[PDB]
Amino acid sequence: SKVYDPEQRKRMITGPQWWARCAQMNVLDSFINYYDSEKHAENAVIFLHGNATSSYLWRHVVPHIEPVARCIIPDLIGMGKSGKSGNGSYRLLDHYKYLTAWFELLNLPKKIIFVGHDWGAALAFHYAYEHQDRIKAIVHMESVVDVIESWALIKSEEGEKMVLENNFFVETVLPSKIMRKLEPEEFAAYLEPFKEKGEVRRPTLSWPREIPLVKGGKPDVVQIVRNYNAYLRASDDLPKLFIESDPGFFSNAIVEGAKKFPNTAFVKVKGLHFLQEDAPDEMGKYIKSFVERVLKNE
């Protein structure tokens, strides 16, 4: 049985409160909603959420890192309070198109630090592969580290029903993979972008449909993941931090995959999948110390 954190309401940040702290920037034919801590712009730490969530996910993690580096946190296209995709497509490369265009408008330093979760990690990994000179360090967790060989309906018409009609990922999966019980306002912040039925929920269906299954998975995504996996396995000069979820959720293949990447520090924190909601401060402190060590080592 899940229970509320009894100290959490006193520091709760509602959706409206978070969105009031964000800015909007035009990007290609749309716009991106994002948080930007602004100060210490000699460095940039870019935090990337994955399916079902938004920049809101990182709200209690980022304050720990802000004093060491500029922190930038987008809502991915079609998610959070960001604009929608010009053609209504939300595959990995659609997200990447808008993300990379946004990066060009941010006045980033030559080398950037990424923090990725879920498909947010895949975006960071793909960016790294295609910009090998622009990466200072990478932190990842519950991430798309490799293709899946070992261990249908979502891709079927029922999947459209499950998600567009029944909101499966936001209303069934999300709360099931948080160990605590979310405050009502906190869940409401995740529901808001996807409160209405139909096409507005597309990104939450398109993400799982990108799954890099060798047998049956989108061939272009399988190749993207193979490519960045090989690069990451050879990236001895690239410092990495892997945050392992305890107990996690079916997370063993993530951990063994993560261990194939050289120059990785390993830490562990409480959680299932959305560990930011169960151990944000522990995560923030680990990330802070890692970043500090990376910058001193330079």
UniProtKB/Swiss-Prot annotation:
Substrate binds at H273. Upon binding the substrate, the enzyme catalyzes an oxygenation, producing a very short-lived hydroperoxide that cyclizes into a dioxetanone structure, which collapses, releasing a CO(2) molecule. The spontaneous breakdown of the dioxetanone releases the energy (about 50 kcal/mole) that is necessary to generate the excited state of the coelenteramide product, which is the singlet form of the monoanion. In vivo the product undergoes the process of nonradiative energy transfer to an accessory protein, a green fluorescent protein (GFP), which results in green bioluminescence. Its EC number is 1.13.12.5. The keyword Lipoprotein does not apply. Optimum pH is 7.4. It comes from Renilla reniformis. InterPro entries: AB_hydrolase_1 (IPR000073), AB_hydrolase_fold (IPR029058), AB_hydrolase_sf (IPR050266), Epox_hydrolase-like (IPR000639). Residues 43-279 form the AB hydrolase-1 domain. Keywords: Decarboxylase, Luminescence, Lyase, Monooxygenase, Oxidoreductase, Photoprotein. Monomer. GO terms for molecular function: carboxy-lyase activity; Renilla-luciferin 2-monooxygenase activity. The keyword Hydrolase does not apply. One of its GO terms (biological process) is bioluminescence. It catalyses: coelenterazine h + O2 = excited coelenteramide h monoanion + hnu + CO2 + H(+). SUPFAM superfamilies: alpha/beta-Hydrolases (SSF53474). Optimum temperature is 32 degrees Celsius. This is Coelenterazine h 2-monooxygenase. This luciferase produces light with a wavelength of 480 nm. In presence of a green fluorescence protein (GFP) it produces a green fluorescence at 509 nm. GO terms for cellular component: membrane. It is an enzyme of class 1 (oxidoreductase). Pfam families: Abhydrolase_1.
